[PDB]
């Protein structure tokens, strides 16, 4: 039997409970899904829904002999039992009409459980909207029937629209990503009120699929004998799962490896390209593995977490996959891009979360990456690279290599490919893959990534191409998946954009940023005692989708003159008018503060540049400017120089009221601005070396303007200069800069 049975069974296990509290009738929830699927999805066979509706011993012993094997109702059952996280083996769960089950708890977030020693214990709640703008806040709210009515219209339409085939599994998990990523899973004990039903369901399908391939691997059937003698921990000790990892090495040096004229579009292109390549190689491994998009836990900026099938054949195709992948890399990217694949062999005794063994299992995996990351290549490829070389006089400028140089110009083929997709990497294009394209990615299949005019006609007629996008426009007719990216632009031209701001100084600002304490957040992600597998992936996907989608929407809604290059918790580079990126930093701080629920903060660096200036020099200088603010980690932003580094509250409160006071008062006066402000600045910035001289001249000159600037205002200028004068010299400085011309 093909794997569509379990993946369409275990992911759609307990889905029909969304209306179990949405109506008043209280039938058995697994049987509720079993009878809805005749009226919701299709004319579905009862044998395919055998694995749906028999999910406990009290519901399997009723049907133990009439429904024989190769229907695999055991499999989704044990997948549910270990996908909850520790144990639900023999108990009448929620939905089996036993008691007054709780039906009003929203999703508890796992932000607190990440570093349990920083928050202790707290119940979080998610404000849902019938994107969606859902935050892991601590204010408690309840789920409603109208959202359940809307999604059950979507379940009687779109789940009716889809078909249970492996070709369209990806679209239904994209649908579930769009809708059920921010819903609770159940209202039981803490194992399934901390996680969504999304990653629980797809990890359930993953566990079912992997143990199906395992039961095919050592050729074991008659599943009553091998599961039902006990709580099955004696059968759970064998190697049946593979918490596997991918890792990109030297991504940052590769994206910065430019010295070109086109140094901004190229930078955007390759920054996107590395993430896209990692996504494609992960998807190829899933397709060659005959799996879905379910067991892939998370793809980040340079790493991927999955779960695999633990057979000797899967290991053999993993070995050949590794050889093919490293051969492709070694004849395209020498050592500058090495990809590291590693799995930690585990058990379902390792997976039932009783005998410790998760953060040290992560540590063993990080060791098995690093043991592979040390011993990279064997012998023959080393000799191949050494004796492959040749002598000539031509080089590409950025990718300073001789090989793959195009004819009669000196840019590399990779490098012309990344300038080709550079200009037309818009906000709306679809990333199509083809055997005929411009980019290069393994195994021997190219990326075109064409716009949504010519890439639409062959996206269905020419099949067997997995097409990626950044718009939610696939309702189930186009077979495209969405993967967003930070791509906001004003109009991507600085000469038109900076002449629009005819208010302040004609200067161009750039921004560099990253997230505080993120490295320790992945050294010890979630602890043992409050662990299910699926929960920590939701954190990272929420952060990534927050960055890409939320920042694109935020720069859209307030019409900012800001162009965007990167997106991420380690990479963020935006270029724009300084009057628009200086006040974007505070609302960026606020939005990432209340997205994290005041747990993870921002180090940022903002500098001010001439409009005609090399953007590579800007990016290097402002990355170093942020690196001055980064170690200061602590939350801080530096303003245009390493001498002006302020914490976020100091910035917001101190300067933006000591700029608001200056702007409020000096625009009331027709004969003080701004020679007095220049003189006040000149005596204020020079008090650092000689002190009582400048403070005395300051007192005298505040006395002599006290009839013009105000009998009150000179007193705040004096006491502010005594108390906090570094936060006023910057305040008058940015007032001067925004009151130029």
């Amino acid at each position: 039997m093909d794997k569509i049975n379990l993946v369409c069974g275990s992911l759609l296990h307990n889905i029909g409970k969304i209306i179990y509290r949405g109506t008043s009738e209280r039938a058995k929830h697994s049987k509720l899904g079993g009878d809805f699927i005749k009226s919701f999805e299709q004319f579905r066979n009862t044998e395919l829904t055998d694995c749906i509706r028999y999910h406990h011993a009290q519901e399997i012993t009723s049907v133990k002999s009439n429904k024989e094997k190769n229907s695999l109702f055991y499999i989704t059952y044990i997948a549910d039992n270990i996908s909850s996280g520790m144990d639900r083996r023999k108990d009448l769960e929620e939905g089996a009409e036993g008691f007054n089950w709780d039906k009003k708890v929203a999703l508890g977030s796992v932000f607190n459980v990440l570093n349990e020693k920083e928050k202790g214990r707290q119940n979080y709640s998610y404000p849902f909207v019938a994107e969606p703008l859902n935050f892991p806040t601590a204010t408690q709210n309840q789920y409603t029937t109208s959202y359940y009515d809307g999604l059950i219209t979507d379940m009687k339409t779109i789940l009716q629209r889809l078909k249970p085939d492996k070709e369209h599994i990806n679209s239904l998990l994209q649908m579930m990503e769009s809708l059920w990523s921010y819903v609770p899973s159940s209202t039981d004990k803490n194992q399934l009120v901390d996680i969504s039903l999304y990653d629980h369901s797809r990890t359930t399908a993953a566990i079912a699929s992997a143990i199906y391939d395992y039961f095919q691997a050592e050729n074991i059937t008659d599943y009553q004998k091998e599961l039902f003698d006990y709580n099955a921990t004696e059968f759970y000790d064998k190697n049946a799962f593979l918490m596997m990892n991918f890792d990109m090495s030297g991504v940052q040096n590769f994206i910065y490896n430019i010295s070109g004229s086109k140094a901004l579009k190229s930078l955007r292109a390759r920054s996107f390209y590395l993430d896209m390549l990692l996504e494609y190689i992960s998807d190829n491994l899933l397709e060659k593995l005959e799996l879905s998009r379910a067991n892939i836990l998370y793809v980040g900026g340079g790493h991927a977490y999955l779960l695999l099938a633990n057979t000797n054949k899967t290991k053999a195709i993993l070995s050949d996959f590794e050889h093919d992948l490293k051969t492709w890399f070694l004849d395209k990217f020498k050592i500058d891009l090495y990809v590291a694949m590693a799995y930690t062999e585990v058990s379902a005794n390792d997976l039932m979360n009783h005998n410790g063994h998760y953060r040290d299992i992560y540590r063993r995996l990080s060791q098995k990456t690093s043991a592979k990351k040390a011993n990279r290549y064997t012998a023959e490829e080393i000799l191949n690279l050494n004796h492959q070389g040749t002598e000539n006089a031509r080089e590409c400028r950025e990718c300073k290599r001789s090989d793959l140089l195009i004819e009669e110009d000196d840019i590399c083929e990779i490098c012309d490919s990344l300038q080709k997709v550079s200009r037309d990497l818009t906000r709306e294009n679809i990333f199509v893959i083809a055997n005929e394209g411009v980019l290069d990615m393994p195994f021997g299949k190219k990326m075109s990534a064409l716009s949504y005019s010519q890439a639409d006609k062959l996206k269905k007629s020419n099949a067997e191409v997995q097409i990626y996008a950044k718009n939610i426009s696939e309702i189930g007719q186009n077979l495209m998946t969405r993967i967003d990216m930070g791509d906001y632009t004003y109009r991507s031209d600085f000469h038109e954009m900076l002449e629009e701001v005819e208010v302040g100084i004609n200067r161009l600002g750039v921004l560099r940023a990253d997230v505080d304490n993120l490295g320790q957040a992945f050294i010890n992600g979630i602890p043992d005692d409050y662990l299910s597998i699926s929960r920590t992936a939701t954190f990272s996907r929420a952060m990534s989708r927050f960055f890409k989608n939320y920042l694109n929407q935020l720069l859209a809604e307030k019409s900012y003159k800001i162009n965007v290059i990167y997106a991420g918790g380690d990479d963020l580079f935006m270029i724009g008018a300084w009057q628009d990126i200086l006040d974007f930093s505070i609302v960026l701080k606020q939005k990432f503060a209340d997205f994290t629920q005041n747990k993870l903060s921002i180090s940022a660096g903002i500098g001010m540049f001439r409009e005609k200036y090399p953007v590579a020099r800007m990016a290097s200088l402002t990355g170093d400017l942020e690196d001055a603010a980064k170690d200061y980690t602590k939350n801080a932003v530096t303003l245009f120089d390493a001498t002006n580094v302020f914490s976020w509250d100091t910035l917001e409160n101190d300067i933006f009221v000591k700029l608001d006071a200056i702007t409020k008062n000096f625009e009331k006066l027709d004969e003080t601005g701004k020679a007095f402000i220049y003189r006040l600045i000149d005596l204020l910035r020079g008090v650092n070396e000689n002190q009582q001289i400048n403070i005395a001249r300051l007192a005298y000159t505040l006395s002599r303007m006290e009839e013009k600037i105000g009998k009150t205002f000179a007193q705040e200028l004096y006491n502010w200069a005594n108390a906090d004068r570094k936060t006023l010299i910057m305040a008058l400085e940015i007032y001067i800069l925004k009151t130029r011309e």
Partner: protein
């Protein structure tokens, strides 16, 4: 062989030189002078000295038409002839800062300039930071000798370039009162080995 050209750069005015990528405050000087990244003492790049000598050799040598000697003495990377640069320059730091503080004055002054619009008479003030006049930059130049028959010709055409630089500036806003140098007590001494006819080189530098 390999020879050392020694001397100093006694400064008669100016020397605004170079320019860094520091953020120009509103405040004090925008476009500051070039200074060392650790010690923050004013120095000239040896490339600017090298380039003024190369330029002033270039404009006068074969006056009427690049040349051999502009590549014989200062290197080339042409597609037919490539020559090793016979000279050897080092970046020159400020030397007499001890006696430039006996006058209790800073190493670097700030100079206040402006243009006025001809059309509207609206001024446009700039501050430029430059090292004070009367600086002395003790410099050393080495010489990549590879042929004895050209030492006297090379030295008479670098001493010619040594005096032609005194009537031109060295870097920065030159035609508005900057950069004018003078060269005191120039000499030559062999680095390693032993050359025989060092007297003519030493006198032609002392001439």
């Amino acid at each position: 062989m390999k020879l050392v050209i020694e001397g100093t750069i006694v400064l008669k005015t100016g020397m605004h030189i170079g320019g860094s990528s520091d953020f120009s405050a509103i405040g004090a000087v925008a476009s500051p002078v070039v200074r060392d990244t650790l010690t923050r003492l004013p120095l000239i790049p040896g490339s600017s000295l090298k380039g003024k000598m190369r330029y002033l050799l270039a404009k006068e040598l074969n006056n009427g038409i690049d040349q051999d000697e502009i590549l014989r003495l200062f290197g080339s990377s042409e597609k037919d002839k490539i020559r090793r640069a016979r000279l050897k320059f080092n970046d020159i730091k400020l030397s007499n800062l001890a006696e430039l503080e006996t006058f209790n004055v800073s190493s670097t002054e700030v100079k206040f300039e402006n243009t006025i619009n001809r059309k509207t008479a609206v001024a446009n003030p700039r501050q430029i930071e430059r090292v004070i006049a009367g600086s002395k930059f003790d410099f050393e130049i080495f010489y990549n000798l590879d042929d004895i028959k050209e030492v006297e010709k090379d030295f008479e055409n670098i001493k010619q370039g040594f005096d032609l630089l005194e009537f031109d500036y060295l870097g920065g806003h030159g035609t508005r009162g900057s950069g004018r140098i003078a060269f005191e007590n120039l000499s030559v001494i062999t680095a390693v080995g032993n050359f025989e006819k060092i007297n003519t080189l030493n006198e032609i530098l002392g001439a």
